[PDB]
Amino acid sequence: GSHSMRYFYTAMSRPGRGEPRFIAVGYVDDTQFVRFDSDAASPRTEPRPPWIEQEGPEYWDRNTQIFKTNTQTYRENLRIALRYYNQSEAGSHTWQTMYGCDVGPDGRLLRGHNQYAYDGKDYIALNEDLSSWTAADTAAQITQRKWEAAREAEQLRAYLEGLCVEWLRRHLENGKETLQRADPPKTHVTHHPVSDHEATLRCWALGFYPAEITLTWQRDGEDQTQDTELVETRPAGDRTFQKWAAVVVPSGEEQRYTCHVQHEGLPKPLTLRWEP
């Protein structure tokens, strides 16, 4: 339907074990296509999907350069962040940033993104209007007036509305075959006894992309939310994902239960049961 290009930066400080490490990875929906690690022997931006490879020298250059600066950028951040929180130079702190641009099933910019987090806590974030910021603590507010003072918000937008989207669109064309193809899950229900009176019903969904899915269980048509046991959606390794739900039923009533599945690869939602 709609797509999104997204970037993830992560910086860790290690007192005594060298300068802080910076790793950058880029996606387009649930697919990764770039990587950069200041901790690699001879760091440079490396491809992670086939389609990106067709880009020329320039692209790889310009990017590697941007990434090397960003390495120095976040190192001043770890340093600064110490004065904002009265922290010592002896501890280790992680810095996390995310930023991207969602496009709509038509091509135009649907919405932009940019958030920051210090040690897992939300720091500051540009609002959906792409012109103002939301700070989480007095420290963040110091950061804000800087950015407001330097019209930093505008820069980000000019990107998010220009370069970011212009590329998400290109990246998508060279990757039609996969990026723009949904692989509906292969579903089925399984039976596992437990007690002469109870039994487990496990509803599976395998080999599907994108990872956004929905598996539900029902007893006589009513939801079993608080009784269902859902596992986090885990990656298959081939690019698809997996997921499963479970509910424990009394021996006999198993037919009074129905699994329900939704995924964009399915035209109409599904409804499975145990087929003994």
């Binding site: 930066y9 880029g26 310009r62 941007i66 600066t69």
Partner: peptide
């Protein structure tokens, strides 16, 4: 392609 983020 990728943005040049400003310091904290």
């Amino acid at each position: 392609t990728a943005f040049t983020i400003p310091s904290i």
